[PDB]
Amino acid sequence: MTEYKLVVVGACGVGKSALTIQLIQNHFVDIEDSYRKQVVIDGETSLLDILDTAGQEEYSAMRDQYMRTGEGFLLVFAINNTKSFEDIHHYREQIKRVKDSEDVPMVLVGNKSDLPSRTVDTKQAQDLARSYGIPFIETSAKTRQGVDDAFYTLVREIRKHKE
């Protein structure tokens, strides 16, 4: 069985845990930072091993391990959090440094899309993802919009990389 090590990175409060809980446990409530579940993606059985991290948590050694062995990364910001969008470049640069590669599978995720407060335009996000050469997916952990698509797209980016 193929295992995919995934890391979900982004500023505190953008909804990394909520997105992963929705994916793995199929619910939303308005704790766990690591998750592990077998799913079927395009007919292929995959074990997803997932860490959520803002890079400010106490277990730095574990974080660095996951960062080094992470095969794909979700770069998460919230559409009502301009600072979290601005932080994305820092996170991408950090991943590139630790992986020591310019071709690391990543997906840009704009979460909280159900909320009417928006300070980051979809155009801004699309433009950034284009510059990085990665997909952009709008999500809501609350409504489930885009949640499977975000993670499954990432798994597909990993497969394309391994080809």
Q: Which residues bind ligand GDP (CB under 6 A)?
A: 10, 12-18, 30, 52, 111-112, 114-115, 140-142
| Of 48 and 159, CB closest to ligand GDP | 48
Angle at 86 between CA 101 and CA 113, to 5 degrees: 105
Cα separation, 146 vs 3, in Å, equals 22
| Of 22 and 159, CB closest to ligand GDP | 22
Q: C-beta of 17: minimal distance to ligand GDP in Å?
A: 3
Q: C-beta of 98: minimal distance to ligand GDP in Å?
A: 20
Q: C-beta of 20: minimal distance to ligand GDP in Å?
A: 8
| Of 46 and 111, CB closest to ligand GDP | 111
Question: How many C-beta atoms lie closer than 10 Å to residue 7's C-beta?
Answer: 24
| Residue 122 in tokens | 């979809």
| Of 140 and 153, CB closest to ligand GDP | 140
User: Gaps (C–N > 2.5 Å) in the chain: which residues precede them?
Assistant: 30
107 within 8 A of 95, measured Cβ to Cβ = no
Q: C-beta of 52: minimal distance to ligand GDP in Å?
A: 5
Closest among 156, 108, 159, 153 to 134, alpha carbons compared = 108
| Of 47 and 115, CB closest to ligand GDP | 115
Measured from each CB, the residue nearest to ligand GDP is 15
Angle at 118 between CA 117 and CA 121, to 5 degrees: 165
Q: C-beta of 11: minimal distance to ligand GDP in Å?
A: 7
| Residue 111 in tokens | 């979460």
